[PDB]
Amino acid sequence: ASEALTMIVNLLRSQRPLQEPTVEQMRAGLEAMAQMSPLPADVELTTVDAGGVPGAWVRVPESDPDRVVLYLHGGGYVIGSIRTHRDLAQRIARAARCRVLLIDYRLAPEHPHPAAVEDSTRAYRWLLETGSDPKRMAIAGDAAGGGLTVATLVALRDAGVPLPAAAVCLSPWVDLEGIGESMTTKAAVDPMVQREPLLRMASMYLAGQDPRTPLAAPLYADLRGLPPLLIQVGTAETLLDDSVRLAERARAAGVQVTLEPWEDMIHVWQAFAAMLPEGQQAIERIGEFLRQHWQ
Numbered sequence: 493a494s495e496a497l498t499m500i501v502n503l504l505r506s507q508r509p510l511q512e513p514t515v516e517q518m519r520a521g522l523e524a525m526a527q528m529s530p531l532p533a534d535v536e537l538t539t540v541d542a543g544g545v546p547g548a549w550v551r552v553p554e555s556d557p558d559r560v561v562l563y564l565h566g567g568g569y570v571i572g573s574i575r576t577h578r579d580l581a582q583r584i585a586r587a588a589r590c591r592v593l594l595i596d597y598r599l600a601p602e603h604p605h606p607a608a609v610e611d612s613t614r615a616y617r618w619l620l621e622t623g624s625d626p627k628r629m630a631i632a633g634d635a636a637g638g639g640l641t642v643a644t645l646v647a648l649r650d651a652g653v654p655l656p657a658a659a660v661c662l663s664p665w666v667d668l669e670g671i672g673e674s675m676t677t678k679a680a681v682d683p684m685v686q687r688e689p690l691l692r693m694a695s696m697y698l699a700g701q702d703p704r705t706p707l708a709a710p711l712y713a714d715l716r717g718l719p720p721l722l723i724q725v726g727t728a729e730t731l732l733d734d735s736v737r738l739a740e741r742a743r744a745a746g747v748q749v750t751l752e753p754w755e756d757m758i759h760v761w762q763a764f765a766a767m768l769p770e771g772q773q774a775i776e777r778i779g780e781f782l783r784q785h786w787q
């Protein structure tokens with residue numbers, strides 16, 4: 493992998509807190525990290541009320557308004573914001589030549605499961621209400637947001653709502669018990685994501701609910717009828733087998749799944765695309781995948 497990869501890994505390793513951070517710290521820490529990736533001048537951000545869910549359109553000059561990605565940010569269902577993921581959003585908007593709706597969905601522990609799913613489905617329904625065609629739509633998201641993407645599809649389907657053309661999951665989190673093999677074996681090679689912090693955020697999101705609640709942990713959801721699914725995952729991730737198990741399950745349910753394991757990549761490496769080549773390569777692929785399914 494690139495020298496940029498080894499640099500980011502060592503920097504993350506070196507700056508990892510020596511004790512468990514609070515929700516307040518993680519929130520403000522991610523917000524800070526996020527500000528090191530500045531927003532290019534041609535990016536257009538427009539705040540909007542997505543059917544009672546706050547959000548922002550992210551557009552670049554290339555964008556085709558008729559193509560829309562509903563983007564669901566990661567951060568354990570506990571952290572993240574429009575501002576933490578706007579860079580990733582604009583790269584996708586750029587690569588897929590689309591508009592991206594980045595929503596500030598409700599977060600745990602203030603708003604536990606299923607508040608997140610309530611918001612994502614509402615935002616999706618709002619998109620149809622305002623005239624977006626599912627044939628030119630997609631849902632995408634990273635990690636917790638990658639899990640939320642699957643959950644949202646399942647929920648919409650079960651509600652009889654027309655599903656989008658395609659969907660994309662980046663390092664998705666779908667096992668809230670962390671019993672995948674790579675949680676034990678790949679633990680350490682991932683500078684982020686350890687079991688203990690993971691399960692703590694699971695606890696907050698669940699607020700007592702069964703950790704295999706299907707819409708919370710979509711590894712246990714019924715995936716039949718889902719549209720073409722691109723899953724990008726790094727092979728140095730503790731969440732690798734979240735993607736492996738998701739692909740297995742989705743394909744057994746007749747979903748056209750594409751599992752893309754990027755060698756040596758770390759959790760949501762695409763977030764580092766500003767300086768990580770593979771990050772930008774992966775996003776270019778996202779755009780390619782989406783444009784294929786929109787024609």
Ligand SMILES: COc1ccc2cc([C@H](C)C(=O)Oc3ccc(N(O)O)cc3)ccc2c1
Nearest residue numbers: 525526529566567568576635636665760763
């Ligand atoms: C430099 O610009 C950025 C901007 C945002 C970032 C966001 C993330 C964050 C951790 C992210 O969205 O990924 C997740 C999502 C969910 C979890 N679980 O399961 O708790 C763990 C990581 C990481 C680097 C980032 C870098």
